[PDB]
Structures are given as C-alpha cells and as structure tokens.
Amino acid sequence: MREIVHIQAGQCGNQIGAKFWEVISDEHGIDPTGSYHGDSDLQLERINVYYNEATGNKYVPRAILVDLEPGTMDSVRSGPFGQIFRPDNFVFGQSGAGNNWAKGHYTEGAELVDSVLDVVRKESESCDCLQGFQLTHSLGGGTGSGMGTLLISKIREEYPDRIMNTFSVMPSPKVSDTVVEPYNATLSVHQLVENTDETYCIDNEALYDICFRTLKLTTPTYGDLNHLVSATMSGVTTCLRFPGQLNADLRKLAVNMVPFPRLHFFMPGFAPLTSRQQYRALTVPELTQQMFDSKNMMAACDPRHGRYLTVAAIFRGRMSMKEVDEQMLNVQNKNSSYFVEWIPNNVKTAVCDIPPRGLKMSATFIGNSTAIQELFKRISEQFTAMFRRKAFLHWYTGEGMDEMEFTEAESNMNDLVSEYQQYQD
Amino acid sequence: MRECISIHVGQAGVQIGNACWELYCLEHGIQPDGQMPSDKTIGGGDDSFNTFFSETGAGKHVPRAVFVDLEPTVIDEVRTGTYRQLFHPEQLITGKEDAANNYARGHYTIGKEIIDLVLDRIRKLADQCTGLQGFLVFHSFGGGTGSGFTSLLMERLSVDYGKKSKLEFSIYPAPQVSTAVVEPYNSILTTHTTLEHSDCAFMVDNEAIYDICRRNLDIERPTYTNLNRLISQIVSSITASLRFDGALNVDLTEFQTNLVPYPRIHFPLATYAPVISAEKAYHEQLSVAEITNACFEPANQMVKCDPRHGKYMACCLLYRGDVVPKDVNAAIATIKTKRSIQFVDWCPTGFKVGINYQPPTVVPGGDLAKVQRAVCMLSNTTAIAEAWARLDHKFDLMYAKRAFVHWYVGEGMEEGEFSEAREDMAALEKDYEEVGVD
Amino acid sequence: MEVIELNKCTSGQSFEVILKPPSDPSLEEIQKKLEAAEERRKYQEAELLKHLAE
Amino acid sequence: MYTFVVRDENSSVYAEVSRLLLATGQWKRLRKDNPRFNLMLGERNRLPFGRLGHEPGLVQLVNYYRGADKLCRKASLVKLIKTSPELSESCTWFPESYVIYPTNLTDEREVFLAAYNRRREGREGNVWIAKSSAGAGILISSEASELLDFIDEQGQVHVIQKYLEKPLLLEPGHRKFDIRSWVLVDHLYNIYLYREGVLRTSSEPYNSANFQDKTCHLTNHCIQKEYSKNYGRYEEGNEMFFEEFNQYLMDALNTTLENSILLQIKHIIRSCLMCIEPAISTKHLHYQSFQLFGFDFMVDEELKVWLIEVNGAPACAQKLYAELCQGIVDVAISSVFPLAPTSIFIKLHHHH
Numbered sequence A: 001m002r003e004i005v006h007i008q009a010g011q012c013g014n015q016i017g018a019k020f021w022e023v024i025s026d027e028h029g030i031d032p033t034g035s036y037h038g039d040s041d042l043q044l045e046r047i048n049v050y051y052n053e054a055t056g057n058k059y060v061p062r063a064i065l066v067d068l069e070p071g072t073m074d075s076v077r078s079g080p081f082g083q084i085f086r087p088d089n090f091v092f093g094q095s096g097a098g099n100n101w102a103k104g105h106y107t108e109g110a111e112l113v114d115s116v117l118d119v120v121r122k123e124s125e126s127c128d129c130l131q132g133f134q135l136t137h138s139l140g141g142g143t144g145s146g147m148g149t150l151l152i153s154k155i156r157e158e159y160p161d162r163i164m165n166t167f168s169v170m171p172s173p174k175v176s177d178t179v180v181e182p183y184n185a186t187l188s189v190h191q192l193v194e195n196t197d198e199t200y201c202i203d204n205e206a207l208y209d210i211c212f213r214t215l216k217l218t219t220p221t222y223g224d225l226n227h228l229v230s231a232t233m234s235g236v237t238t239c240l241r242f243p244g245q246l247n248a249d250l251r252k253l254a255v256n257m258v259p260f261p262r263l264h265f266f267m268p269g270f271a272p273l274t275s276r277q278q279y280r281a282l283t284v285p286e287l288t289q290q291m292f293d294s295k296n297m298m299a300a301c302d303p304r305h306g307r308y309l310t311v312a313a314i315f316r317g318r319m320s321m322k323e324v325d326e327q328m329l330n331v332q333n334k335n336s337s338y339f340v341e342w343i344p345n346n347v348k349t350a351v352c353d354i355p356p357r358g359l360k361m362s363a364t365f366i367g368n369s370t371a372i373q374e375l376f377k378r379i380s381e382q383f384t385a386m387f388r389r390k391a392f393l394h395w396y397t398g399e400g401m402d403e404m405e406f407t408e409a410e411s412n413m414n415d416l417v418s419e420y421q422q423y424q425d
Numbered sequence B: 001m002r003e004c005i006s007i008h009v010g011q012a013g014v015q016i017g018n019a020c021w022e023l024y025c026l027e028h029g030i031q032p033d034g035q036m037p038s039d040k041t042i043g044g045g046d047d048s049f050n051t052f053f054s055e056t057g058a059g060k061h062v063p064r065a066v067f068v069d070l071e072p073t074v075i076d077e078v079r080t081g082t083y084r085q086l087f088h089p090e091q092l093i094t095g096k097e098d099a100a101n102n103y104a105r106g107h108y109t110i111g112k113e114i115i116d117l118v119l120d121r122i123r124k125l126a127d128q129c130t131g132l133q134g135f136l137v138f139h140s141f142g143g144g145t146g147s148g149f150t151s152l153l154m155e156r157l158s159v160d161y162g163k164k165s166k167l168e169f170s171i172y173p174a175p176q177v178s179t180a181v182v183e184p185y186n187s188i189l190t191t192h193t194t195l196e197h198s199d200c201a202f203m204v205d206n207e208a209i210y211d212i213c214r215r216n217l218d219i220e221r222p223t224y225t226n227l228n229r230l231i232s233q234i235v236s237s238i239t240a241s242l243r244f245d246g247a248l249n250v251d252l253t254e255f256q257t258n259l260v261p262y263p264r265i266h267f268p269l270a271t272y273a274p275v276i277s278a279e280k281a282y283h284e285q286l287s288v289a290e291i292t293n294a295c296f297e298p299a300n301q302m303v304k305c306d307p308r309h310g311k312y313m314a315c316c317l318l319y320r321g322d323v324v325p326k327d328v329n330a331a332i333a334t335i336k337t338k339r340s341i342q343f344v345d346w347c348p349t350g351f352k353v354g355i356n357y358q359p360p361t362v363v364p365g366g367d368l369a370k371v372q373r374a375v376c377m378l379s380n381t382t383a384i385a386e387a388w389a390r391l392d393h394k395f396d397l398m399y400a401k402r403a404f405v406h407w408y409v410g411e412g413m414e415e416g417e418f419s420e421a422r423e424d425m426a427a428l429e430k431d432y433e434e435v436g437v438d
Numbered sequence C: 001m002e003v004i005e006l007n008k009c010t011s012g013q014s015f016e017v018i019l020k021p022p023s024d025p026s027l028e029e030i031q032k033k034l035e036a037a038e039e040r041r042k043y044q045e046a047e048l049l050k051h052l053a054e
Numbered sequence D: 001m002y003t004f005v006v007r008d009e010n011s012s013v014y015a016e017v018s019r020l021l022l023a024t025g026q027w028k029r030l031r032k033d034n035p036r037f038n039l040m041l042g043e044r045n046r047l048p049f050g051r052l053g054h055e056p057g058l059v060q061l062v063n064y065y066r067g068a069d070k071l072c073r074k075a076s077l078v079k080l081i082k083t084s085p086e087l088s089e090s091c092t093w094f095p096e097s098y099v100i101y102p103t104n105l106t107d108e109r110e111v112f113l114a115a116y117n118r119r120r121e122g123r124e125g126n127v128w129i130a131k132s133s134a135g136a137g138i139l140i141s142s143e144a145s146e147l148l149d150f151i152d153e154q155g156q157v158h159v160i161q162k163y164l165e166k167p168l169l170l171e172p173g174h175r176k177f178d179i180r181s182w183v184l185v186d187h188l189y190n191i192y193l194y195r196e197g198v199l200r201t202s203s204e205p206y207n208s209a210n211f212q213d214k215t216c217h218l219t220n221h222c223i224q225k226e227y228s229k230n231y232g233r234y235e236e237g238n239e240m241f242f243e244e245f246n247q248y249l250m251d252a253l254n255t256t257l258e259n260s261i262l263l264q265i266k267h268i269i270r271s272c273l274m275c276i277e278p279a280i281s282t283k284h285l286h287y288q289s290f291q292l293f294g295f296d297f298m299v300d301e302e303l304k305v306w307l308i309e310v311n312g313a314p315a316c317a318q319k320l321y322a323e324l325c326q327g328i329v330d331v332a333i334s335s336v337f338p339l340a341p342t343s344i345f346i347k348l349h350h351h352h
C-alpha cells in the first residue's frame, strides 16, 4: 500500500491531469462512475497506488484539483470522467492569476494555499504508507507555475522525507499564450531545482513539432498536444501502477535516476508515434530505434548534443523479453559515446504485459541527459532578451516582487546550465 | 544434536529461503502442513533433521528460521503460499517501506528502528535450542535491506551470540537481472562492515546462475524462480551435512576449520554438477569421474573466474547419490594428471570428501532433471578475487564523481565510510594477491 | 595418494585424501554509531526547515 | 558495428591491425576505458583479464592468452621444459639451461657447476651464455666464475644455457644468424605459422677466439645497427628472407629450407604450444583469447634447429607488416566477428 497523492494546478495542469486520469482509469478498468469492470487481476493489484476505495467497491482517484479561476475545473467536472473525482477535492478561487507568477506564488495564490493543504493533509492521513506526491502543471502561466511551486514548498515543509515528483510543461514561442512565459518559467525552475526529486520536462515546442511533422496534424490544438502527454504520463507511471521489480516506487526510481541532487530533470519519450499504416505490426527493433530517436523526445533537446547519465526504459505488451534485451544492448553498444562511462550499467529496462489502449505494444523512454541544458539555455536567453530592458516587469513589481528576485532566478538557472556542462565533458 | 537458525533478509534472501525450505521439506518428507509421517518421535526428538526443524505437540515440523524484509509484498507471498502452514506469524517480519536500494537507509535510518524487534524474534528461536550452533544468513549484496540491514544484524549477532558461528549465502550483483545502479556501492559497504563478523561466506553471482540456466536448462530468459530453484540445490548440498547423519561438516565450526585457514579470506568458490534440463528426452547419466571433472570447469562455478590462475587453500567434495569412495579416488587421480591444481605451500594438497547416498531431490514440475549422482565442490581459491576486482572497479568509477553519494549522506551516513569501506576492500584484494601470486 | 579418516554410516561416508604434504564493536559502540547518523539526519532536516522558514 | 579498444600505444603490430579494422568501415574504436567492447588490444603488463567476459550480450576477445608468459619468459621457459613431461628434461631441441638467482636473494647453481665441471674434465667445449628478461645485458664466457659473478652484480633472475659453439655460418661472410617465426593462435587454439620468416643476420665474421666483442655473437637487429660496421652489407637491414635463404641452402648445401630446418621448427612450435594448452585454453571460458608469438631459433652446422626463446609481444619485419597484420584480422578477429587465397599461414594440426 504505497499511495501517491496527485495534484493538478492551473489550466494546463488540470487539462493534462484530466486526460491522465482518463487514460489510466481505462487501463485499470475503472469507468467514469468509479466502478471496476476489468477482466484481469493485474489491474487491481496496485490500484490503491492512485485510487482510494470507497463504499460499494468504488474507486476514487487520489487527486486534488487546484486553480485560481473556476473555468477549467468546471470543464473537468462536466468532462468525460468528471464525476469520478471527489467533489471535496476541487479547491479554486475566482480572481485568476493573469499569467503572473507573482500572483500565483505571493498574492492570489497565498490566500488559497492553506485550503489546498487541508485537502492534501486529508488525503495523506488516510494513506497506509504514503510514497509521495506528483504535480501536473505548466511553468509558463501563473497558477500552475507560481501557486504550483508554492504548494510544493509548503508540502515539503510538512512532508520533508516524502518524494516530490512533477510533470512540468515548459513554454515555447511556437505554442504560447503570453510573452512573459520565460519569466514565469525561470522563476519556477529554481523552485523545482530545490524542492522536487524528479521532474519530467514536457516541452510544448517538442509536442508541437511531433504533431505537425510526425503526426501530420496541419493545425495542432492543445488537445492534440495533450494526447501525447497522456500517453507519456501513462508510460512513465506503468512501473508504479503494475507489478514489477525495477523502480516500482518513487524513491527507488529517484535513487537510480538522479546521481546529483539538482540534476533531476528528465527527457521523456514514447513510441510508436504513428499518423493515420496505423494497423501495421511494430517490431522490437523499431520500437527501440524510435524510442531513442530525438524526434520521439518530448523535451525538444537533441540527445546527441549531450550524454545520458541514466536511462529508464519500459516496454509494454506481449513481446520477446529476450529480443528486448538484445535490441537495448544493441543501442547502448552501438552508441556508447552518448552514455557516461563512469556510471556502469546505467541503462535499465522494464517490461509490462498490459499494453496501452489501442496498441499491441509500446515503449516509454525516461532519460537523464546533459542535453536538457539546451532547454534551460533557450529559456534563459528568452528571459534575458526581455529582462535586460526590464520589459513587462511592472506586472510583477505590482505584486510586491523586487527586481533582485529576477536576477537571482536568472543566476540560478545559468548555474544549473553550467552544472550540466561539467558532467557532459 | 545442535540447532541451526536460518535468517533470510530482503527480497533475495526471502525468495531464496522459500526455495530452500521447499527443498528441505521434500528432502526430509515433510508435507506443506508440517506433518512428517516418517518421524516416529511425535513432538520431540534430536535427529539430524531436528537441527533445522523443531516440533510441536501436534507433530508439526517448524523451520528454525526468521524471514525479515522492510516491505511486506515479498513475505506476504510466504504468508499465503503453499507452505504458509510451516511458519507461525512471529517468524515472518515485514516493515512498510523498504530501503530503496540504499545501504544507509537499510542500516541506519530503518535498521535502527527494527533491529531490536528482529533480535527478539531470533531470541525466541534460540530459547528453543538446547545447543545452538549459529546462524545461516541469506541476503543480496545489492539491495538496501540485503546489504544495509544484514550488516547491522551481523554486528548485533556477534554481540548477543559471541561464541556462535555465522555463515553467509550472499547474492553478488549482476546487471542482467539487476536494475539498481548503486549496487556496487551497497556491495562494498556491506562487505566492509560484515567482514569481521562472518566466519564463511558462499557468494553466488547471479550472472553465473543466469548463464547456467540458459546454457544447461535451455531457459531463454530465466526468472528469479528459475535462478532460485538452482541456488537452493547448491545450498542444499552445502547444508546437507548438518541435516543428515554423517561425519563431514557436521557443525558450522567445521566449515571454517575445513575451508578457511585465514579469517579474512573466507569466500569459498562453489561448483555444482550436473545441471541437466528436465525437458530433455532423456540424458545419459554421468559417472563419478565425469561429474568430478566437471567441478574444474568454469561453466559450472557459482562465480565466473579462472581457478587455473590462482592457488587453492582447501577443497571439499560433497557427493549426493550413487557414489563410492573407490570411484572418487580413481577420479581424483585422473584429474590431477590433467588439471592445473596448485595449492599454497602452507596447505596440504588434498581433498575432504563427503558422500550422502540419497540422490538430489528435484521439485516436481521444476527445471532440473533427476540424476543418480551429483557433486558440489567447495574450494577456497584466490581466483575468486576476480569478483572483488570487478566490483571495486565499478565502485571506483562512480565514487570518483561522487555519483549517488548524496543519497547515502542524506540518510546520516558519513562520506568517510565510503573510502573506509573501499580501503578495506583494497587490503582484501592485497591479501589474495599475497597468498596466490608468486 | 593416501586416504585417512574414513567414516561410514547407513546414509553415507566421508574421508580425506592427501596427494602431497605441505612445505568487535560493543553494544554501546553500535548504539553511538546509529545515534550519530540519526543526529546527522536531524541536523540536515533542521537546516531544510530553517531554509523553508526563511 | 563492432567495437574495440586500444590499450598498448607502443604496439606496431596492432597499430596496423587497428588501422585495418577501421578501414573496413565495420569496426569502431572506443576510449581505452570503455567496457562495452568486442575486442581488446590489451596492454603488455598486468592486463586485467578478470574484467573480460562480464558484459551482457557482448562477445569479448583479447589479443593475449592469460598464462602464456610461462612460455615467453626466460626463466619461466626453462622451468617449463624441465618440469613438463611433454618436453622432459632430455628435450633434444632446447640448449642445456639453468635458472640462477643472484646470491642477493628453486636455484640451480650447484646443478650447473656439476655439469660445468663435467665438460671441463672431458675436454669438451665449455662456453655458456648468461642472459635475463630485464635486458635491453648479456655475457658470454668459458669460465663459470665470470658467469656467476656477473649475475650477482645484478638483481634479477638470470639463465645460463649452453652457447652454440658450432652455428651455421652464411657464406660469404662467415657470419652468424637466427630465424624469427611468427605464430598465431586463435580462440580455437589452431596453431598458424606465418609462411614468411626472417633471418636476423650478423654483418661481422664469426670469431670463436674472442667472446669479448659481442657484435658477431649477437644477431639482434639493434646490436648490429649500432655496434656493427658492416650493417646492411650482404642483405638490407641484416634481414634475409626465406626465398633467398632457401636458394642458398640449395646452392650451398644441396637441400631445402623445408626439409633441413622448417620441419624441426614446426615440430618445436607444436610441442611448446600443445604443452601449455590445458593451462591457457579459453575453450570453455567466458571470454576468448588469441595471441601472436615470435619464436627465435638457432641452426648449428649440422642443420639441427634449437629453440632460443619465445616472444609474447613480437614486432614484425617492415616488409611483412601489411601481410601478417591482414592475416591476423582474417583468421583471429573476423573468424569471431565476421564482416558483411591461398592462406598466408601454415596450419599445424594437432590433438586438442
């Protein structure tokens, strides 16, 4: 009974979080009303990881929905699986955060944060043995970014020895709402460097390119982007949701994936990514080749520009475990220059028999690569292009922030980039 | 009759323990409910098998064993498994969250809070013993519990049972079946702190068991069940002298006397033959000379290394089945004229031989075929130092960068314990080279 | 090639063949190590809480 | 795509093999400390054999047989021949030798003197040579006192063996020589003799009445090219190849190189390598080995061949690098890692 408490904050956080629960509920046989209708015992074996069991054999997601405006959470409550969530676990305000990190972190967010912690505390108190937390949010907005990292800080204060995990959506000019997103993301990244154990970097720049170039979607929508995020979140949590030996829990994953405390930002990847030739059987060699392909990466960084510190791979579906080991060893032995040679046997592989919906077999990639510095460099350059002219700062100083806090965040992220660079050489 | 208490620590120790006690029951004719028809002394007795099994008034034969794990899922299988009725709940100890593959978490953070409970349960078994010999401790090197909690337990056992022998069965890490990158750290940390507390340690390299299962059992991708059923066969051969009538290795003290002339060099190499697939149409039964000759092939060793390039300090041959001394001696004569067997000058060149007429038992439906004779050779070779070098080398690669060290310091371990443990291993490798190389 | 110490019983026998002749920390100390590490953990957690209070 | 590592930058032989491996477009070189290799061109000393064959899914091959130093060490070779029944103490193709430890440190001092005193009493030629593996350090004398005193002045093990006082002298010149044979042993322990040998000839006339000047008594390529005044006179670089040497044997001795010399050379090679096969074979080992050996022979005026030593890390004649190194790739490396004639080797069949 290793329970995880899930939190989703802001527009992005709640829309991706909704799709995540929709996907895994289907995989575990839970219908929109919380009733189980599966046909395999593997579905319920580890169900309590993400679901509470209520009267009448009902399974209720251990999820807390947070926002500073009601709109998105109204949509969730009226969505496909909206009725499966605990009505008490909707915590929202009315003011909004105005795409402003300061509003989420210091003013509007500060007024609502205690009521969220009350719900978090309620869910944790009923856990047999709480593993830790997972937060879904964007870094480019105000609520998920500012209030999300505020929540992480207050959760760590109350649960200092629990694991904090996040799925963090990084902003990109190609899929942007406002010009201040580099500000909100730089402020948030520093919080994550200090207060999270594992962060899955989900780059909207990569999600767009995959949709446009690989899936041939002429005009990608946020819904198209979130289909990739749902599939990825399901893949990376498979080790937690089904019987297995590798990782299997948040702390063990962290111990195998994070050799240095600040370098806990992961490049996720998924295969196949097929456009509508969609019925063709996919071989283990193809699954393995694509899973390591940069075009299958959702961080928008080229792995061949850095080195892998650690890699976790998860194969799903009925396949040849012997062939899985062969192709994996083939990739490592054929490109051993992109794997640091001072962490022996740093590529681990796991297999799960239950494939995702509508696929015979798939592969999910989790990489701790020094190439992720390209992502932080990109944000840092966009931050500096505006900050050198103090552009748009009045939105933040109007909420009580000083310019010095921006300079410190700017320096903290450039420090992070420098740390990745030393282990790359 | 002197009792032996088995202690199984962590997933590897528990699952191997389940395979062993399953085999012990089959070898002694004990049913899953603990009943033993052939035992005419109901609720008592001092037979050889009583070294490993106590008896209740109702005739239940209870393993003298404790299972310990910091998470419940592995031991939960035992509680609801085929042999659930063998143990009473006090013998199966589980915590709620494991050591996360972190030696420091198993030894310090969690070990400090459960050690007293584990010692109390062990004391309850000791109170049933009229003449306790000591302990057999099963554990992995790589796990946070198997490494960290075992070393703490061994330290306390030396305090609470100063005059008792302690033997180890230790699983050396192999990447083919491992998924924890820090296992070299945990292996060296637990070896450093356990070295002075263990009288004799039988290391089994998962890489060796894995390849034997693929090569000899035609298993494309062996599971822990496949690995453990083979390991239990080797463990059974080693402990058979304690559980059946005989005169060789009849008590734990004799393992040290016969296999370990130098206390720190207490890691005998185990070699086992024959391993034959049950799915085979029908195999030819190997002779005494053939299975004896097989003991000097690297392919059947529990740790892959080359004994041709080391020195022997002791060598025991443990036969099971249709074997007579005449054939053993004739086989030994032939192997000396062909094999490169070099003993150290301060040890006699010879072999201690034990023969148990009962052939090996195979679990029904298992992978191993029934054979008429088998042998396990226990040899103390400097060649096993190859395993220490490999492990220390991986340790050095990661530690030079301090990779993952913060996980250990965060549990309250000092960084100096790493270098202390590593320096002890360097002195161990130097001990082997002084004994083995000219 | 000499055999010595042949012992026989109903269930087996044992002997030795010679081919060539030759040529701790106290309970108190364990407790201090466990408490010392616990103290180091508590100190690190106090610094974290201090950082979070700031 | 195969992978290999280079751990001996001073190896001319495997610098060419490495050059050829890359030219095939199917072999990739890794940093010398990367464990994920198929082939290790290991270092000469303290090659870590214990870390080979422990990589899941990688067939690993190294260019050295663990334990072959027993054959490629001066003192070790003597001890091997005297103690191994396959070779016996009465071995007819190895000069009478003794292992002598300097008095500042078993030892065969007294045994040597007994045999030495016997020759002195029987009017027989009593000239011995003292040498060791720690040399570039050789002494040739007819007095046992000088030989033993020269070794005590040193600090490493030495060997005293009979000096061939009746060597075969090439004409014109009246000069000494030795024969170098290259032998390759693959992972299956097939013994391949390179069809091409070299005679390292002395450019100075052989003088039996003066062992002080060692230019005419030592056929080493470096000694002739530094202290000899007729270097390169009769043959380029004091290296005569089999074609010219075979023609000489026919013209002068009315015989052939195959009949008079090579049959013995092939016999000696088989005897040495078969003797240690059980000790070094990698047949059932978790990694595989091959190794290139350099055998050095002497021929007396009776056309009897004597083994001088075996080199574990030999070089090769400049003219023969391309052919031999390509042969190593064909039979020793590509046989294990195939790529996507008239062999240059002579297979010495034997019983395994």
Ligand SMILES: Nc1nc2c(ncn2[C@@H]2O[C@H](COP(=O)(O)OP(=O)(O)OP(=O)(O)O)[C@@H](O)[C@H]2O)c(=O)[nH]1
Pocket (backbone or CB within 6 Å): B009, B010, B011, B012, B013, B015, B016, B069, B070, B098, B099, B100, B101, B102, B106, B140, B141, B142, B143, B144, B145, B146, B147, B171, B172, B173, B174, B177, B178, B179, B180, B183, B206, B224, B227, B228, B231
């Ligand atoms: N032969 C064999 N090896 C095992 C088995 N289970 C785990 N291992 C090995 O043990 C090592 C991992 O240690 P575990 O025993 O699983 O960990 P633990 O002792 O439970 O400690 P924790 O970190 O708290 O889980 C790896 O090298 C595994 O390959 C088993 O059943 N049989």
Ligand SMILES: Nc1ncnc2c1ncn2[C@@H]1O[C@H](COP(=O)(O)OP(=O)(O)CP(=O)(O)O)[C@@H](O)[C@H]1O
Pocket (backbone or CB within 6 Å): D095, D129, D131, D135, D136, D161, D162, D163, D164, D165, D176, D177, D178, D217, D218, D219, D220, D296, D298, D308, D309, D311
């Ligand atoms: N017993 C002997 N009788 C006659 N000549 C001998 C001899 N032992 C050695 N030599 C001469 O010494 C030379 C080389 O000696 P040796 O081979 O022992 O030294 P070395 O090993 O440093 C040269 P290499 O290793 O290249 O063959 C040969 O050319 C040979 O002519």
Ligand SMILES: Nc1nc2c(ncn2[C@@H]2O[C@H](COP(=O)(O)OP(=O)(O)O)[C@@H](O)[C@H]2O)c(=O)[nH]1
Pocket (backbone or CB within 6 Å): A009, A010, A011, A012, A013, A015, A016, A097, A098, A099, A100, A138, A139, A140, A141, A142, A143, A144, A145, A169, A170, A171, A172, A175, A176, A177, A181, A204, A207, A222, A223, A225, A226, A229
């Ligand atoms: N992938 C994805 N990104 C989103 C979604 N909604 C918003 N974003 C991104 O999130 C950032 C805006 O933050 P948002 O979550 O809308 O602000 P918040 O409600 O204050 O937390 C921008 O980078 C958007 O591109 C979504 O549904 N999917």
Ligand SMILES: [Ca+2]
Pocket (backbone or CB within 6 Å): A111
């Ligand atoms: Ca307000």
Ligand SMILES: [Ca+2]
Pocket (backbone or CB within 6 Å): B039, B040, B041, B042, B043, B044, B045, B046, B055
């Ligand atoms: Ca009884």
Ligand SMILES: [Ca+2]
Pocket (backbone or CB within 6 Å): B158, B162, B196, B197
């Ligand atoms: Ca003791």
Ligand SMILES: [Mg+2]
Pocket (backbone or CB within 6 Å): A011, A012, A141, A177
């Ligand atoms: Mg928005």
Ligand SMILES: [Mg+2]
Pocket (backbone or CB within 6 Å): B010, B011, B071, B098, B143, B145
């Ligand atoms: Mg465990």
Ligand SMILES: [Mg+2]
Pocket (backbone or CB within 6 Å): D309, D310, D311
């Ligand atoms: Mg030489």
